Structures are given as C-alpha cells and as structure tokens.
Design a binder for this molecule. Structure first.
Ligand SMILES: Nc1ncnc2c1ncn2[C@@H]1O[C@H](COP(=O)(O)OP(=O)(O)O)[C@@H](O)[C@H]1O
Ligand SMILES: Nc1ncnc2c1ncn2[C@@H]1O[C@H](COP(=O)(O)OP(=O)(O)O)[C@@H](O)[C@H]1O
Ligand SMILES: [Ca+2]
Ligand SMILES: [Ca+2]
Lengths: 342, 269, 358, 248, 357
C-alpha cells in the first residue's frame, strides 16, 4: 500500500484467481483497462513448466505495453502450487502506462495472495523474462552478495574470533597475578587458623611498601563477624564458619574480600583485586587450606547467618512464576480435540 | 487402546529419550502406564536398543577404561563383550550396571589388527575428547575381516539443564591393496532451561584407505578418522553462523527490509 | 470537476492539472522582502539587489512557513488562476520530510485555503513508479538539493537516503564564475538568466574529464557558440564539461562532499544485503540537473569502477524525467479510483492534524 | 490425576518439538483421562485451512473452534457450516478485521510470506485475543524449516479508556534444518514460551491494536533474539565442549 | 626507569606513564596518508584531512592494519610521550577475544622494531573490573567503535559469554548529526562532526523512560538546552539530547539489526552457568567513554531488573573515573615493582621465541 492507483480487481479476476489457486491454469495475463484490473489471456497447463514457459509467455509480451504475467510452476508449497509473478514494463512505453502498471503491482500481488508467489521478476526486455532469463534470476540468487570493505573486515574478525572462542587458553583470560610478599606474622596467623587454633584472620595490604600484612586475629563468632568488616578500607578475611548442614556439623573456612566503595582509592581497590589470585594460591597450595567459599561483600552488615549459609550451601533454582491465560471463548461447546491431519 | 499398543507407545517414547535423560522419561512413562510388569515385559528390547544406540559407556570392576555398549558387542542373555580385555559381562540396561565378568574366548584369529587399531584409536580419543571412550571390535562378517571403531563422548549437566552426546562409528575391512572406509558421526544436544531446544545432527563419510600391515594401515585409518571428524565439527561451528544470519533469516527477519520497526498508528487507517 | 498537482521544489514550483502531459506553470519558489509585504517568484527575482531573497523549500524541506503560504497563494491565484475551494490538490514532499512538517502543510491546505480534498506523495516514489519500477535507487538532482533514495516495493529506506547540498543552482553559480574568469561579465539579473540558458543548452557531462580537458586545450572542436540578446556571439568551450563536472567533483565549488557516483555507491551499500544487487540494476534519474548530455554514460562508468566487477549495473535515464515527479502525480490524481484515497476537508475537520500519515 | 499430568508435561518438555503432534496423540492414547487438561497446557503446531468463500487461507486453533467446525476470520462463517456457533460481538468483529489486516502487515514485513490470523473475544470487561503466524521453509533441502507463533493477549480494559492493562503469553515453535556437504544434516529446533505484562496509553491515536501490535512485535523480536543468542549459542558451545579440533 | 601505559582504543589511543592519575596524552587512532608529507597520525591527520586519506587500524577493536598501527605506536612513543622506546618498559592493552596471533605480532613489533626492554599485554575489561574493586562481575565497555559485554568470574573472563556490539560513540555522534540536520540545523562536514561530538558529550543523557520523555518533550521546553557554536550562533537542542544515546538500547534508530546493550548484558549473563549469574547480575561495572551519559546507570538498572528474575538483586557500578579506568588500572599495575619482574624482558624474547606471551 504505497502510492497505489486504487485500481482494484474486476470480479472476473477474483473468480479466475480462486480457480487458479486450484492449480487450474498455467498462465494468467493481467492488464489494466478503464480503471480496472482485468484478465487478458489465460492458458491451461499442457506439458512441464519448463517446456510451457518460452511458448506460453514470450508472445504475450507486447513491445511497448506493460502487463502482469502469473506463471504456475510445477513446484508446490503449503498454500498450494507456487507461482512466478513477472512484471513486464518495457521502458519505451508511454509513461502513463508505466505509472499505472507500477502503482498497481503491489495491489494486484496482495489480491492474488503473497504466499503463492515465490519469485517476482521485473523485466524491461525479452531477455530479462525469457526462460533463460528466469534461470539466470535463480542463478543470481545463487550469487554472492556485495559487501563493503568494513562489512568484510568485520567478518574476518568474526571468524578468527570464533577460533579464539573454541580455544583452550584460560591464562590470557585474566591479567597475570600480582605477588605481594606475605608477612611472617600474617603467614603464621593463617597457619594457626588452618590448624583450628584461631577462628578469624584479617589481612591488610601495605600499599606503599607493597607487602600484605596481618591486621587482626580477634576471636570472631558468627554474630560478631559484621563488626569485623571496616566501613572505610578494603580487607581480606579468613573466617571459621561453624555451621550445621543437613544434619552434620561443619567447621569450614570462608574467604571474604571486603571492599566498601569509593572510600577506597582506585589504587587501593585495584591492588586488592590484583593480589587476591596470588594470596589464595599461597593459602591453598602452600598451607593446604580448604576454602569452601570466596565471598565479595561491600558492607559487613551483609553477613547474616542466612547470608553465609546461602553463599556456602546454595538452594535449588527457583522456577519462574507464571500468570494465567484469558478465560477463552465463553460457552465454547466442545471438548478440545487435536487438529491433526494425515 | 490396546495394551500391546500402549507398550509400543511407551517404548517409542523411551528410544527417543535425550542423552542423559533416560531415567527421567522412563519414570514418566512408568507413572503413565502404572503397569510396571506390562512395561518391563513389553519394553525390555526398547531399553536394550536405547543402550546400544547411544553407545552407553560402562565400567567393569578392576578394569581401567570403560567399555561401550553397542550392537557389535551384543552376545545374548543381556550379556555384552569387552574386546580389549577379552572378557564378557552381564549388563543391566535399566540401571546400566556391569556384573559377572568372565573371560571368554573369541575365535576368528585377527588379534594384531584389533590391538593396533585399539591402541591408535584410544590414543587419538585422548587428544580430541575431554570425556571420550572408545571400543574397537574385529569381526569376520560375510567371511571378510572388518574393524569397527566406536567413539563416544558426552557431558551431562542436569543442574544447568543441558546434556550432550557424540557418537562416532568407523568401519573398514582388511583387504589388500586397498579398502573402503565408512563412517557415521552423530551429535545430540538438549538444552531445556526455560524452554526446549535440541540439536540433532549426523554425517556419513566415505573414504578409501590403503592397507598393507597393521602398523601403517592403522596410522592411515586414524588419519582418515581425525581429518574427517575435525572437518565435520568445524563445519558445524561455521553452520551455526550461516544459520543465525541467513537460514533463520528466511523464517523471520530480525528487522524488515526498511531497517525500521514498523509504525502501528500509520497502518491503522 | 478537475484536480491539480503541485510539486514544490527547492527552486522551481511545477503546477498544473491532473491529466495534463506537463506542468502548466513553472515559477521560481523564491520569496523576497524589503530590508504587499513581498513579491514571489519571477517578480521577486528581477528585483534581486533591492530585496532580500529567501527560499522556503530550502533543500526540499519547507523551512519558512509564511513564505510557503505566499508561494502557494501565488500558485493558485496568479500562476494557475483557480479557486482552491473547488479543487482537490495533490502535493509532493521530499525525502525524510518530518512528520510535523507534513501535518502543517495538511493544516494549511485545509485551514488556510479550505481545499476540498488533498493528498501528499513522495517525490522519489513517484519518479520511480513513473519508470515502471517499484524497487530501485532514485537520483533526484534538482535546483538546490540532490538526493539518493533507495526504494523497495514503494517504500523509501530511510537509513540509506543520502543528501548532497550541491545541485543546479550551484552549477549555474559556478559556470558563472568560470565564464567571468574567461573575460565575460554576468552581473545583472538578466545576465544571470542568460547563464542559466547557456548551462541548459550547451553544457554536457564528459566521459573522462582529464581526456576531455586535454582535447579542449589543443583543439577548437568542443566550442559551441552562443548568441546574446543584443546579437553578439560569445564562444564557450572548456566550460561545457567543467560546469556539470562539479556533480562528480564537489571540490570544484569547495565542498568536502563526495560526488553523486560515490553517494550512489554509499547509499546502495547502506541497504539490506538482499536488496543491493537489485538496486545496482535499477538506477533511475529524476532531476532537472540530470538532463545534461552524457551524465548517464558517465554514471555507468564511475559506478562500475566503484562496484564489484561481477556486478551488472544499469542507469535508467527517462527522456521524460525532468518533470517525472509532476507527471507521476498527475497520472495518479487523474484517476477516478484515486479519488477515494484523498483525505477530505470534512474528514480532516473530524480527525485533526495527525490524520495525514495514516 | 495431577501427578500423571505433571509427568505428561515433563515428558513433553524432554521430547523433541519437531514431532509434537504425533507425541501428543500418543500421549493422550496412553492416558485418555487427561486429554483436555493436557491440551490446555500444551500448544500444537498451527494448521492451515482454505476459506472457500474468499479462496485464501486461515489458521486453526482452539479459539476459532466451535464444536468440530472452525470459523474463518475472512468470511466470519464456520467450515463446515453451523446453525448457531457463537460469533464475535458486534463491536468486536470490526476490531477483528482491523487487527487481522494490521497483523497481516506485520507478517509481511517480518516473515515475507506465510499466513496469519487473529481471533478476539469478549471477557467480563475488556477482551482477549490470539495472534497466530505460520511460516514454512522453501529455500531447499539446505533450508527446510517452520516457524509457528501463538500470542494470547488479554486486555483488561479500564472503563475510562485512558489506560489498558495488557497481558500476553507468547509461544514459538520453530525448527530449522540444513543439509550441507560439510555439516551433513542439522535439525536445530525448539519451543520457547515467555509472557509480558504491561499497561500502556490508549488514545484515539493509539488504539488497542496499536498497543497489542507493539507488544507482539517486541516479544517476537525478543524471543527470536533469545533463541539465536542463548539457546542455539549454548548448544553450539556444548558441541565444542564434547570434542576439540586442537589436540590437547 | 618508569614504564609506559598504552590503551589501544577503537577510536582513541590513551598513552601515559605508569603511576600517573590520568593519561599523559590522548589522541585519535587514525592514520592519514596522502590521497593517491609522508605520514600524519592523530590530531595532525584530522587537521589536514583534505589532502590525506584516512585509515582506522583498530576501528572495531582488533588491529587489522599492522603497517599503520606501527605508525600509531611511533606517534605515541616519539611525538606524544616524547620518549625512547628502548629505555622504557611498555604495558599494552588487549581487546576482548584478541587472537593469539594478534598478541604475538604485537609483541614482535614491540621487541623487534621498538626494542622495548620488556612488555606485557593485558585485557581491557579485566583491568577495568579490578580497578572497580571486584574480581567477579560483568563489564560493559562502550568506546568509540565497539561495545563489549565481558563476564568475569574470579579473574577469568568467560569467552563463550563475551558479546560484541558494533555500535558505540562514533555511531552515536553520526546519528546526532543526522537528527540535528533533520531538525533544521546543518552538520554534514567533518568540522561540524567535531562540534556535534562536543554537543553530545556536554548535553546528551539517557532518559529513564523514553516514551514519557518524548511526551514531556512535546509538552514543554523544560528539557531544552542551548549550545553556542564557534560561530557564536546559538542553537536549541531539544529531545535530541536523549534520543541520541537511546540508540544504545534500540539499535533500530540507526537502522541496525542488533540488541540494545541491556539485552546483550542479559544474553551474556545467560550464556553463563546458573551458579554464577547471581554474582554477575549484582556486579555490573561500566567502563569506557560512551557509558558517561547522565542517567545510564539508573536506566540500565531498570531494564535489567525487568529482564531478570524478581528475586534477583541487581547492582550497576558506574565509577566516576570509568572513561579512563582501563588505562588507570593498567597504570597502577605497571607502577608496581613486583609486577614488572613477571614481564618478559627483551633478552627472554629471542632465546625462548615469540611464543612466550
Ligand atoms: N536541460 C537542462 N540541462 C541542465 N540543467 C537543467 C536543464 N533544465 C533544467 N535544468 C536545471 O534544473 C534545475 C531545477 O530542476 P528541478 O528538478 O525543478 O529542481 P527542484 O527539484 O529544486 O524543483 C535548475 O537549476 C535548472 O537549471
Ligand atoms: N562525557 C562523555 N559523554 C558521552 N560520550 C562520551 C564522553 N566522552 C567521550 N565520549 C565518547 O566516547 C568515545 C571514546 O571513548 P573510549 O572508551 O576512549 O573509546 P575507545 O574504547 O575506542 O578508546 C568518543 O567517541 C566519544 O563519542
Ligand atoms: Ca523537485
Ligand atoms: Ca577502550
């Protein structure tokens, strides 16, 4: 519906279209005449679409008069038989005819049914719409499409990127760890925690001297754990979560990276993120410390008993709730039955 | 509503169970029939066929590696064959468990070819499969000596809601100076987080191998297997792209040709 | 009764009746006011030095609404001589004309002029349909703006439209410059008209610019002769293929923009991938300044140079193209079946200002 | 029984969606007791009928069904004919023809083919509707495929007309099949069901078919994106997890 | 000796010295070669654009033009930083999913032509995330010519979930040019593109609700701002302040078949295992310049909450310094004494071979 003449279809063409969707005809010629779309010459199928085409179509093509030609292929689709819609508009015609036949094309196409047309050919010469020309139209579909230089650079990026995707690297999916020396005090405190002598070790980084030191080891229970996490500075925590899981009691250690917010300089919260990989390496590899969870909180108040339990032993996936459909057609009269069709 | 047709309905459901989901659809059909004896009687061969079609790997006690359950390993009485260690075992299909391992002599006298192929193939599987198993059979079918290499690989992540299996079968016959190599590769992926999506794929390969002695022919055969399987997998990964931008585009557009989301007030007049 | 179609161009208004073979009235769409409030059109151009000249449809879009009203009133009452209350009026609009602009020209046809019925068509689509096509890329090069409009099944592809602000008025103003540099003087308004006549009668696009320049430097073959109103003969040669050459080298008038060939290539390659091959073979010219000899043959050369060697490239240059936009509109408004599609005063009264797009 | 219905639904969840109608037929065969309940909770592939009055094609679901006869949006009359099957409310049939034309435009702009249908019906206050799109594949053996869209919208129209609250449950059943030399055969297909709730401004400039059309378009764009970028992507990733081209 | 930090941006290169709080020098990553004065790179190429022909070696983030990228590094080292490459270790930034061959060639150029004493290549998104104070989260990096959604769990980016959007600040600038020109102004020349970019950066913002703010644009002149041109002539900018960055959420505005950044963040999170999504949703850090529009964090929070489960806790972290966070973190890392010990020295490149990095 773009700049349509408004020329609709004569009822005769409505009838002949209804019959053509029963596979009745090989060919419908549609012309415009006195403000109406009307049939010209219809033909019945004789041989194959291959052999009909050149003798059925070409002599219906006037030198300087546009027309529409619907040609029934021997293919099929869901709606039924499949058609070629050819638009004949020789460019030497009178512009009135060119205008009408271009500005009623979409209206006729919709009138016939878009589902039944699989190819639309626009020809200005006989070579465009002869059988050879239709074959070449199909071949032109089998042709590669023109891409820009940027469009192809992006495809090159895509294919090498897909190689990277399936690769097994892992090392260059992170920036390599930063190894700050751990202090003897801090190391010894981590050791005493691993042997269940303490239940809390708080580590802090000397940013200037680039070493990680021991800040705290105070006796910490689950209720006092929130009071251990500062509000102004980032810190590392090792804590002995004593809890009860599914009937048996566990003393298990949790690592907590506490980072309060923009109270920390980019330098501070950068170093704290960069040293974690290597610190936990030293803890788990050298001391054989079994760390069951690594938590990253920004406020100490987050650490409720329910929070620690939910982070360590997680619940099942909560399935999505759904609202109910409309009531449907009222007084429908009928058990639902399958619409199956052999 | 014949009960004899009810069991073949139940059996059809089972043979179409996705890899790693056998127990689930089984429990489903069992609660739908609620005729446990009718199901056990009338669907036994369906269980056996599902296990032999999915290359179920099973571990026998005291034996390194696992063994694939295939139609080629069938021995009757619900007993199968492990050709690598030259035994055989009772195998329970429902629970997929291995019992009663007893040594069993196999005649036909082509051990060296099977052993060469099994060494080479099980070396190849370690190079190209994270969780792969392989079983190599040697037979004389229609009086000619045939090697059948089977490869299985799979990942079952029911918590993440996806399972995936890879089956590979490669047959070639010992006939000098050349022999025909047939292969069939199958991939099945089920992803059912908040919907149901499946990938089913298969590919048949025909190639030609040149047979001489065990050491050389097994090498060339493994090279055929390797290159053909790599080609299949690479083509699948590229096919995902071609479908995403071109094949899918046929069914529905990402945007209409105008590249503009259509204005609804404009149409409604 | 009769209807009329009105093509509001960046420099020329083309008006007349539906069913006519050409616009009955063609006048400059210029309004001038001192530093009657104003003159319009041919009147206002002659008095160029004393007045201040303003283009309402600068670059296809109506920028100034009062002046647009004066131009339209001039059309109906002086150039055409009809009563708006007794005639349905089709109007044309440019590419990417904003929705509010549309609403406003509808207003004015109904509120100010009390027209019975009216319709607004897209110039590019009428020009394409007039060539027998519903899919193709239109090159619309007129007085003050040039557009590259890809169109698929009668709908413009908005994100691929390209707009050069170099066009025919610039070509006249540049030919005037180089003629001055030869030794001539074209200062007054009559002489400015003479330069337009020279451009439209003797200029032509060259196949290869450098080869044509080298020819002109060594020969007297390319020197057509022009006669002035007094009777003097002036000779121009080199300029004939250097004036329209600016369409392909906008650096000549100082512009940083690309030529119409490069903008056609860019506009085609901004479309959907399926559509591109068809757009290459359906290149339609639809402007006044697409009337130079040789421009079609030159476009073929430059585009095949820019495009893949496999590609088939066709440039359609209708002989009737100079007024195609109008002709198209005429043929449409001259249809009984097209009468229903017009909006009507009564319907606009009830619906309001936003009825037009719908 | 509720437990058997949950089992039926799970078993549908696991089975391939290419063959839903065969599976549903055999599943109702196993337990015919729960035929209706199951049919409500499961969506079937849409079926194409031809309207002999107008000569073209309409879609079949359980809302255009009265008895064993299906009403066409285009002739408004059931096939085969019926003495008094319930018919659309007087106001609603004009909205139906409007919405059918509108979603026909939607369908041609996105699908470039196939058939579409809309069936609406009165509620207590406000109304409801179904939008059904069926597109097939004709590319080749390398492009076999089918897309089915079922959009069920309920508009609890507020009496004032200022705002309307729209609910919509959308469901896509699709399957693509490629048959290339390199990849062999590839049957990638599934079903997704997502629902959006939102109330937007209703005006003379934006009626219900406007807001509902925008809802259906947004949901289909989102579902097709989610299908291609998540589900198909995840299956691709799984395949490469199973096997590696590069040696370990 | 102090180290060099180089952020190889899609449109803008950001170079400086390790330990500085901001890049010592920032310049466009364009190379200008005479059309058909050997070479002009950066602001010089923009200055003399007419005589020159433009090339964008990293336009999408991946280096595709090595000969021009070598010129860009020469300009960086010698003309902006004004230093000798042999005497200064160099940290380079890497695009997400940069190929291994890409990094090997980058390393080779650095060692064999610039003779750096040692060098290291780091992923952009991970540097930004780390600088944001966490090692688990999903990063949105929107720069000049590329936008990436990069999920990271405990320091490791998950390559399967990495999403590329080819829409960013370049496209936003162009679309603003277009919609202003449609309003009635004129912005079609390169000089005018620079002005319109400034208009974007100083007057654009992301609406919380798009339809409501369109209505409010129609209703009143409340959302209308004024921008004075270098001419001195003043233009009125209306709804186009927020219609422009709205293209980040609806690519169809610029005619693009793609998802909005909210939808791609959601897709990228769903490409991850269910266990970690809770940690991804609650750690959305934004990096890069195109994420600086006032009101994008609240918008993204709204949109993602819509796409997410009801129960889920979603947090968007938009640091004030994000426009340079990538570089900043890098600087910090390169300032460390312990860090450069891990870097590969020049001597170690030749006996070990190019495969080390
Ligand atoms: N034969 C011709 N050769 C070259 N230019 C011409 C010719 N005839 C008209 N023109 C030019 O066409 C321009 C106006 O064309 P038109 O399409 O009416 O412009 P607009 O689209 O702005 O109305 C004028 O500048 C005029 O000089
Ligand atoms: N304050 C700002 N507000 C909005 N956009 C900005 C702002 N500053 C810069 N930009 C945009 O960001 C782009 C460059 O950002 P950057 O992340 O440095 O790009 P790259 O990733 O290519 O280095 C510029 O093109 C500009 O359009
Ligand atoms: Ca014009
Ligand atoms: Ca960047």
């Amino acid at each position: 519906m773009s700049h349509q003449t408004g020329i609709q279809a004569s009822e005769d063409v409505k009838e002949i279209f209804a019959r053509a969707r029963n596979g009745k005809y090989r060919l419908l010629k549609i012309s415009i005449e006195n403000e109406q779309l009307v049939i010209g010459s219809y033909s019945q199928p004789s041989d194959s679409w291959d052999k009909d085409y050149d003798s059925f179509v070409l002599p219906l093509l006037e030198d300087k008069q546009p027309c529409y030609i619907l040609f029934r292929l021997d293919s099929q689709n869901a709606q039924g038989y499949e058609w070629i819609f050819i638009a004949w508009s020789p460019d030497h015609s009178h512009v009135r005819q060119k205008m009408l036949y271009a500005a009623t094309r979409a209206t006729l196409k919709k009138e016939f049914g878009g589902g039944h047309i699989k190819d639309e050919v626009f020809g200005t010469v006989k070579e465009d719409v002869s059988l050879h020309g239709y074959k070449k139209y199909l071949l032109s579909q089998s042709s590669p499409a023109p891409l820009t230089a940027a469009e192809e650079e992006l495809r090159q990026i895509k294919i090498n990127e897909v190689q990277t995707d399936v690769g097994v690297d892992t090392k260059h999916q992170t920036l390599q760890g930063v190894a700050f020396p751990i202090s003897r005090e801090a190391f010894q405190a981590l050791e005493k925690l691993n042997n269940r002598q303490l239940n809390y070790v708080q580590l802090e980084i000397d940013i200037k001297n680039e070493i990680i030191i021991l800040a705290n080891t105070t006796n910490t229970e689950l209720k006092d754990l929130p009071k251990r996490i500062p509000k102004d500075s980032a810190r590392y925590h090792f804590f002995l979560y004593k809890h009860s899981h599914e009937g048996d009691y566990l003393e298990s250690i949790v690592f907590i990276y506490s980072m309060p917010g923009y109270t920390c300089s980019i330098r501070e919260r950068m170093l704290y993120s960069s040293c974690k990989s290597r610190l936990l390496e030293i803890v788990e590899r050298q001391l054989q410390m079994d760390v069951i969870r690594k938590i990253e909180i920004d406020n100490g108040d987050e650490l409720t008993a329910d929070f620690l339990y939910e982070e360590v032993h997680p619940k099942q996936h909560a399935h999505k709730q759904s609202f109910a459909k409309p009531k449907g057609p009222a007084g429908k009269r009928g058990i639902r039955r399958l619409i199956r069709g052999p | 509503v014949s009960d004899e047709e009810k069991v073949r309905i139940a059996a059809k459901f089972i043979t179409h169970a996705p890899p790693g989901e056998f127990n689930e659809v089984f429990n489903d059909v069992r609660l739908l029939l609620n005729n446990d004896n009718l199901l056990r009687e009338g669907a036994a061969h369906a269980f056996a066929q599902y296990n032999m079609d999915q290359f179920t790997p099973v571990k026998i006690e005291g034996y390194d590696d696992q063994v694939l359950i295939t139609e080629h390993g069938d021995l009757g009485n619900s007993r199968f064959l492990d050709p690598r260690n030259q035994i055989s075992f009772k195998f329970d299909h429902l629970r997929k468990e291995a019992s009663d391992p007893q040594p069993e002599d196999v005649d036909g006298g082509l051990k060296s070819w099977r052993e060469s192929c099994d060494s080479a193939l099980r070396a190849y599987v370690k190079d190209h499969y994270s969780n792969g198993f392989c079983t190599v059979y040697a037979k004389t079918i229609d009086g000619q000596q045939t090697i059948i290499a089977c490869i299985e690989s799979h990942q079952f992540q029911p918590k993440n809601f996806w399972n995936g299996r890879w089956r590979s079968e490669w047959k070639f016959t010992i006939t000098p100076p050349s022999a025909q190599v047939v292969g069939v590769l199958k991939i099945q992926v089920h992803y059912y987080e908040d919907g149901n999506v499946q990938l089913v794929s298969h590919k048949d390969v025909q190639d030609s191998v040149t047979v001489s002695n065990e050491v050389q022919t097994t090498k060339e055969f493994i090279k055929i297997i390797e290159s053909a399987e790599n080609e299949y997998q690479t083509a699948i990964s590229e096919n995902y792209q071609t479908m995403s931008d071109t094949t899918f585009k046929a069914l529905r557009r990402q945007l209409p040709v105008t590249r503009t989301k259509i204005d609804w007030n404009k149409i409604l007049s | 009764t009769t209807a009329l179609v009105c093509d509001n161009g960046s420099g020329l208004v083309k008006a007349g009746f539906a069913g006519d073979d050409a616009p009955r009235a063609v006048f400059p769409s210029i309004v001038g006011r001192p530093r009657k409030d104003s003159y319009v059109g041919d009147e206002a151009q002659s008095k160029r030095g004393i007045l201040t000249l303003k283009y309402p449809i600068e670059h296809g879009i109506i920028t100034n609404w009062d002046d647009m009203e004066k131009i339209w009133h001039h059309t109906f009452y002086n150039e055409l001589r009809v009563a708006p209350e007794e005639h349905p009026t089709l109007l044309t609009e440019a590419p990417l004309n904003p929705k509010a602009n549309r609403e406003k020209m509808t207003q004015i046809m109904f509120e100010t002029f009390n027209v019975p019925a009216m319709y607004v068509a897209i110039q590019a689509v009428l020009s394409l349909y007039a060539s027998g096509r519903t899919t193709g890329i239109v090159l619309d090069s007129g007085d003050g703006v040039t557009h590259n409009v890809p169109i698929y099944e009668g709908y413009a592809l908005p994100h691929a439209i390209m707009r050069l602000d170099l066009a025919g008025r610039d070509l006249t103003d540049y030919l005037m410059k180089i003629l001055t540099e030869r030794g001539y003087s074209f200062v007054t308004t009559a002489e400015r008209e003479i330069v337009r006549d020279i451009k439209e009668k003797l200029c032509y696009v060259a196949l290869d610019f450098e080869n044509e320049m080298a020819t002109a430097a060594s020969s007297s073959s390319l020197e057509k002769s022009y006669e002035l109103p007094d009777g003097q003969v002036i000779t121009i040669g080199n300029e004939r293929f250097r004036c329209p050459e600016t369409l392909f080298q906008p650096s000549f008038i100082g512009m940083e923009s690309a030529g119409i060939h490069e903008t056609t290539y860019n506009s085609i390659m901004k479309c959907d991938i399926d559509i591109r091959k068809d757009l290459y073979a359906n290149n339609v010219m639809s402007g006044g300044t697409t009337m130079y000899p040789g421009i079609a043959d030159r476009m073929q050369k430059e585009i095949t140079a820019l495009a893949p060697s496999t590609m088939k490239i066709k440039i359609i240059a209708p002989p009737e193209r100079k007024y195609s936009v109008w002709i198209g509109g005429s043929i449409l408004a001259s249809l009984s079946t097209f009468q229903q599609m017009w909006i009507t005063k009564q319907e606009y009264d009830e619906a309001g200002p936003s009825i037009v797009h719908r | 029984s509720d437990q058997q219905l949950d089992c039926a639904l799970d078993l549908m969840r696991r089975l391939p969606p290419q063959q839903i109608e065969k599976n549903l037929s055999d599943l109702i065969d196993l337990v015919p007791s729960l035929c209706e309940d199951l049919l409500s909770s499961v969506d079937q592939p849409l079926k194409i009928a031809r309207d002999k009055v107008v000569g073209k094609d309409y879609l079949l679901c359980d809302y255009n069904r009265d008895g064993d006869s299906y009403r066409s949006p285009w002739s408004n009359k059931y096939d085969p004919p019926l003495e008094d099957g319930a018919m659309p409310s007087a106001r609603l049939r004009k909205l139906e023809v409007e919405a059918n034309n509108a979603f026909d435009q939607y369908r041609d702009l996105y699908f470039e083919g196939g058939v579409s249908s809309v069936y609406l019906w009165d509620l207590d206050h406000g109304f409801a509707g179904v939008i059904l799109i069926k597109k097939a594949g004709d590319g080749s053996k390398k492009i076999k495929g089918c897309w089915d869209s079922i959009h069920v919208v309920e508009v609890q129209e507020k009496s004032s007309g200022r705002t309307a609250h729209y609910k919509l449950t959308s469901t896509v059943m699709l399957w693509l099949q490629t048959n290339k030399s390199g990849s062999g055969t590839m049957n990638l297909g599934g079903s997704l069901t997502r629902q959006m709730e939102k109330d937007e401004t209703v005006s003379d400039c934006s009626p219900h078919i406007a807001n509902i059309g925008r809802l259906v378009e947004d949901m289909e764009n989102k579902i097709r994106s989610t299908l291609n970028e998540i589900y198909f992507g995840k299956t691709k990733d799984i395949v490469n997890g199973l096997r590696s081209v590069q040696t370990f």
